[PDB]
Every structure is written in structure tokens, then in C-alpha cells.
């Protein structure tokens with residue numbers, strides 16, 4: 001679907017109502033597979049970090065590490081398609097101009113590609129932007145084909161503010177996710193028992209970012 005139709009008919013309404021929006025079959029199988037290949041290539045070639053230190057035992061050889069990451073600009077060799085995804089995300093947000101809350105998005109971060117090794121590690125409950133650093137929207141694209149949470153875990157659980165219940169999102173292949181980056185969406189990644197890949201970009205609100213530079217300097 002054209003970025004515009006998706007943004008106007010689904011993304012905008014959903015975000016303003018729930019603060020969370022899931023779009024399946026974003027780029028299609030062919031493009032999705034290419035991004036998956038590039039990401040897997042980055043991993044296999046050692047472009048990722050060793051992973052977040054979860055437990056620091058006395059013996060550093062027993063230390064358990066979690067999610068591995070790598071920042072991607074989208075212009076690097078072998079990351080062309082990742083750049084395409086980023087460009088597609090940008091087009092989508094551009095068409096949401098002035099319709100997502102009262103925000104005015106004028107920029108984004110590079111892409112943060114994350115890999116949960118599948119060794120039982122996840123990500124503790126947290127808020128992406130709890131101190132007003134400018135990030136208003138978190139966008140995540142998943143690349144895990146035939147992912148079955150009942151067997152591999154890795155579910156993204158969001159705890160919507162003021163709502164007793166929570167929203168569980170499986171990291172399904174070619175799935176695109178949007179949610180407010182602030183305290184409205186505390187979330188966690190449940191333990192993953194299979195290699196789990198995701199690509200995240202954060203979009204900045206013009207005003208929040210402008211004044212963030214004042215304090216955080």
C-alpha cells in the first residue's frame with residue numbers, strides 16, 4: 001500500500017487513539033527478505049556488538065550478554081535495502097505531518113539494528129524517552145519469518161498508561177510498529193529463545209528537540 005493511504009487511514013487514527021499501531025506486510029516478501037539478508041549478513045560478518053551485559057560473574061568467561069546492536073546510516077555497502085526501509089519509514093512519517101498528536105517531526109536517528117541472540121535474554125521494562133530528549137515516536141520493523149512466540153518467546157509487551165491491560169506484539173516478519181516514545185508506553189521484550197532481529201528508528205519532535213539542546217548540553 002502507498003505510504004499515504006496507510007498513514008491517513010490507519011496510522012494516524014490508530015496512534016491518536018491508542019498510541020500504538022501495528023502494520024503488517026509493510027514492504028512485502030521480496031523486499032523484506034532482502035533486508036533480512038543484509039541484516040543477517042551484517043551479523044555473520046561481525047558488525048554487531050557482543051551484546052548487552054546481563055550478568056557480570058566473577059569469571060568474565062561466564063558473563064551472559066543479551067541484545068547485540070549496530071547503528072546503520074543506510075548508505076553503507078550491503079545496507080542499501082535497509083536504507084530503502086528507512087526511506088520508506090520517512091515517507092510514511094512525512095505524510096503524517098501535523099496529524100500525529102500536536103507534534104511536528106523534523107528529524108530522526110540513524111537505524112538501530114538489534115539482534116537478540118536467542119539465549120533466553122530479553123529487555124527489561126523501560127521507557128524509550130523518559131526525560132524529554134526530543135524523541136516522540138518509536139518505529140520498529142521486524143524481520144523474523146515464521147516466528148512462533150509460543151515456542152521462541154521474544155514478545156514485545158507494552159504497558160499502556162492508565163490501562164490495566166497490556167499489548168503483546170510478536171516480532172513478525174515484515175511487520176512495522178509505531179508507538180509514542182514517552183512515559184505513555186513503558187515496555188519490555190520478553191526472553192527470546194531464537195535469533196530475533198528488529199530495526200528501530202526514532203523520530204524527533206521539532207520543539208521538544210529544540211529545547212532539549214538547552215538542558216542536555
Ligand SMILES: O=C(O)CNC(=O)c1nc(Cl)c2ccccc2c1O
Pocket residue numbers: 067069114123128140155156171187188189198
Ligand atoms: O525489539 C523490540 O520489539 C522492542 N525493543 C525495545 O524496546 C528496545 N529498546 C531500547 Cl531503548 C533498546 C536499546 C538498545 C538496544 C535494544 C533496545 C531495544 O530492543
Ligand SMILES: [Mn+2]
Pocket residue numbers: 126127128187
Ligand atoms: Mn524500547
